[PDB]
Amino acid sequence: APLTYELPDETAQLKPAPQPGFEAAQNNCAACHSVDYINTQPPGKGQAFWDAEVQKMIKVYHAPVDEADAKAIADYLAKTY
Amino acid sequence: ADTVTLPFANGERPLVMYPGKRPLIGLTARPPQLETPFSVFDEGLITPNDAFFVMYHLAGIPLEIDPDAFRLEIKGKVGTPLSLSLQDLKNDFPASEVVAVNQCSGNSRGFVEPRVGGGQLANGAMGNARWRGVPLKAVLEKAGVQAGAKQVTFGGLDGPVIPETPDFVKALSIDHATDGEVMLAYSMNGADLPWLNGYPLRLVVPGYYGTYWVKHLNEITVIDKEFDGFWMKTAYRIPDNACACTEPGKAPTATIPINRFDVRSFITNVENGASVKAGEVPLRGIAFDGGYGITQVSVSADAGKSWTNATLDPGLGKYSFRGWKAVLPLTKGDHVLMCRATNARGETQPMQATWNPAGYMRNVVEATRVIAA
Ligand code: HEC
Numbered sequence: 001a002p003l004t005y006e007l008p009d010e011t012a013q014l015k016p017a018p019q020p021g022f023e024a025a026q027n028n029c030a031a032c033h034s035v036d037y038i039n040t041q042p043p044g045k046g047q048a049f050w051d052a053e054v055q056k057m058i059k060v061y062h063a064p065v066d067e068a069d070a071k072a073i074a075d076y077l078a079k080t081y
Numbered sequence: 082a083d084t085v086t087l088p089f090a091n092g093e094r095p096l097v098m099y100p101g102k103r104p105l106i107g108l109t110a111r112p113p114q115l116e117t118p119f120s121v122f123d124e125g126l127i128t129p130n131d132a133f134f135v136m137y138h139l140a141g142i143p144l145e146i147d148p149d150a151f152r153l154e155i156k157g158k159v160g161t162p163l164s165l166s167l168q169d170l171k172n173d174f175p176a177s178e179v180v181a182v183n184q185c186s187g188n189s190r191g192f193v194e195p196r197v198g199g200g201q202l203a204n205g206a207m208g209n210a211r212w213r214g215v216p217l218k219a220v221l222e223k224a225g226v227q228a229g230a231k232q233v234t235f236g237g238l239d240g241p242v243i244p245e246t247p248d249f250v251k252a253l254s255i256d257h258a259t260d261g262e263v264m265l266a267y268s269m270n271g272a273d274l275p276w277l278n279g280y281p282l283r284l285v286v287p288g289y290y291g292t293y294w295v296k297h298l299n300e301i302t303v304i305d306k307e308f309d310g311f312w313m314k315t316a317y318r319i320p321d322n323a324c325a326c327t328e329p330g331k332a333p334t335a336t337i338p339i340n341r342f343d344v345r346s347f348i349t350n351v352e353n354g355a356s357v358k359a360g361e362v363p364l365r366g367i368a369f370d371g372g373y374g375i376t377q378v379s380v381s382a383d384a385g386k387s388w389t390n391a392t393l394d395p396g397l398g399k400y401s402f403r404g405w406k407a408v409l410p411l412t413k414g415d416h417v418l419m420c421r422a423t424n425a426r427g428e429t430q431p432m433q434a435t436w437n438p439a440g441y442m443r444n445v446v447e448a449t450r451v452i453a454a
């Protein structure tokens with residue numbers, strides 16, 4: 001038989017917020033990687049940092065995210081993280 | 082009972098337990114990225130397999146591998162393409178061994194100021210191991226490298242979750258690939274590679290940052306041009322100057338691929354706020370570089386106003402951690418301890434940290450405040 005490897009369960013979750021971008025981030029930002037990538041970034045980086053992170057995902061890594069959702073997500077992140 | 086906090090902002094991390102591993106600092110789960118607790122580096126010069134750090138870029142890592150069916154393909158600008166089993170590698174080629182540091186490009190990124198995006202690591206994204214395997218030079222010689230060859234590309238079993246994401250492929254120059262030190266490792270600390278460290282086979286590139294050390298390595302292509310894949314052309318770029326640095330907030334005007342390690346040193350047996358007995362205080366730690374040899378390690382107990390020469394431990398190889406020891410007289414009270422290494426070509430560590438947009442290559446003189454009583 002082949003050898004196999006068992007990963008533990010993923011538990012990482014995004015910080016809830018009343019902004020619509022929270023749900024848009026839930027729906028768009030966990031498809032390629034766990035959201036601990038977001039949770040662990042430097043804190044209080046602000047608007048330009050998170051705008052750039054979101055644009056990189058879409059333009060460089062081809063995340064299927066529309067313009068409206070992209071703004072919502074980047075705004076939710078900049079306010080929350 | 083299951084978290085730590087690294088000494089930079091937003092430093093909380095779970096302690097997580099993976100098969101074959103002791104608890105490690107969980108950075109990301111998918112893909113798994115795991116940092117080594119700093120205390121491990123005081124436990125011995127060779128990092129145990131169960132403690133060794135883990136970094137990946139893409140969620141689609143292999144989780145089932147039949148070692149019998151596994152093949153390493155050698156192709157492109159060669160006379161004879163090869164399909165090699167692990168048994169072929171172990172039996173048909175002589176073996177080589179090297180004790181060598183693997184260190185992430187962004188090891189220590191969390192300490193960079195201003196903070197930059199990416200893997201927020203403390204200093205535990207490095208480790209030292211006795212690697213055993215086949216020199217790449219030997220396998221390429223068997224294939225027969227063709228004149229006009231310029232680079233070799235390296236790809237593994239992992240893959241993007243969404244096919245449009247650039248697959249993880251790296252490149253070395255042909256002269257580098259055939260130098261005899263670049264190794265196709267099938268063994269780590271006398272055992273088959275741990276799964277997350279690239280079972281059953283990985284590239285080892287002594288003295289070079291870890292991005293080149295492709296894991297689960299199954300595809301080697303000799304090419305007659307410069308490779309322009311995303312992870313060479315766009316990612317892993319450093320400022321094209323001596324300090325590999327820019328003014329904080331400024332983009333470099335020209336870049337090149339990241340390459341050899343710069344010189345680093347750490348004191349391992351004390352951490353911030355540790356208590357020591359005033360008098361002769363024993364200090365120990367490690368130093369390493371890109372393979373030129375550590376010439377000296379100097380130690381200071383007065384924040385760099387004066388230096389004492391440490392005694393270097395017997396070496397394990399030019400690519401290994403080099404141990405050192407020093408006994409310093411400490412007066413009662415606070416002391417800022419530092420160590421600073423230099424190598425045989427005159428490379429050293431800066432007293433003040435430099436910066437670059439990606440937060441690669443940090444090697445500032447490490448300071449540690451202790452209390453003598
Ligand atoms: C696949 C198309 C992705 C989608 C969907 C999202 N991201 Fe992503 N992200 C992707 C990759 C291949 C990587 C690098 C992984 C590595 O270990 O190198 C990342 C990384 C991040 C990071 C880390 C910082 C950085 O490298 O820029 C962050 C903060 C991040 N991703 C955030 C993020 C958000 C907000 C997303 C929704 C718009 C999102 N990611 C989606 C690929 C993909």
Ligand code: MSS
Pocket residue numbers: 133134135136137138139183184185186187236237238239249277278279290291292293294295296297
């Ligand atoms: N295949 C593969 N390989 C690979 C990868 C991925 O992702 N994939 N990563 C890198 C990196 S990035 Mo930075 O530069 S560091 C690093 C390394 C690590 O190793 P370990 O995990 O074994 O420790 O690996 C290397 N290799």
